Design a protein around this nucleic acid. Structure first.
Ligand SMILES: [K+]
Ligand SMILES: [K+]
Ligand SMILES: [K+]
Length: 149
RNA sequence: CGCUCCUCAGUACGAUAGGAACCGGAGCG
């Protein structure tokens, strides 16, 4: 499967934000999630880490929030995320940088830290069930929204 | 006392997608 994200990027010459169509291979994104550690933070880059998808640790939805519908029961279930995100009963979503070229993000480096880019592969803790590809609409900041596939 | 860098630490904390400080190290005023 191929996922497409439209990410606005600032063209210097026109000083205006333009739509860049970015394509991701699900197979490569999944491989990225397997190469990354099964932890929540605790790495030099901070990734991978808990993706709340609008909930708090007790599966309670933050008011005025619509979680992303992934289409897989495991991915759409309200999460159970304890303090360290390592409880022996936890189940929640993790986000990790993913790129069109498929390379593995250098999760262990803090200084300098690799640019995570606009996209993330979202997968479950602790079985790493693939959920989807999400990305920032503008540059590398703001909320993350589900890309198409 | 103030400012820059390291470290503390991607820790504490946070959930608008981020993120300290004390102690300690190196400087300038
Ligand atoms: K954390
Ligand atoms: K400091
Ligand atoms: K100090």
């Amino acid at each position: 499967a191929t996922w497409t994200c439209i990410n606005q990027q600032l063209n210097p010459k026109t000083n205006k934000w333009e739509d860049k169509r970015l394509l991701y291979s699900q197979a490569k994104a999944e491989s990225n999630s397997h190469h990354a550690p099964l932890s929540d933070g605790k790495t030099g880059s901070s990734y991978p880490h808990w993706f709340t998808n609008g909930y708090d640790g007790n599966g309670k939805l933050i008011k005025g929030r619509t979680p992303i519908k992934f289409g897989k029961a495991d991915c759409d279930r309200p999460p159970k995320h304890s303090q360290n995100g390592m409880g022996k009963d936890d189940h929640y979503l993790l986000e990790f940088p993913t790129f069109p070229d498929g390379h593995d993000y250098k999760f262990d480096s803090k200084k300098p830290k690799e640019d995570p880019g606009p996209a993330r592969v979202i997968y479950t803790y602790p079985n790493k069930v693939f959920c989807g590809i999400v990305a920032h609409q503008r540059g590398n900041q703001g909320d993350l929204r589900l890309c198409s596939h």
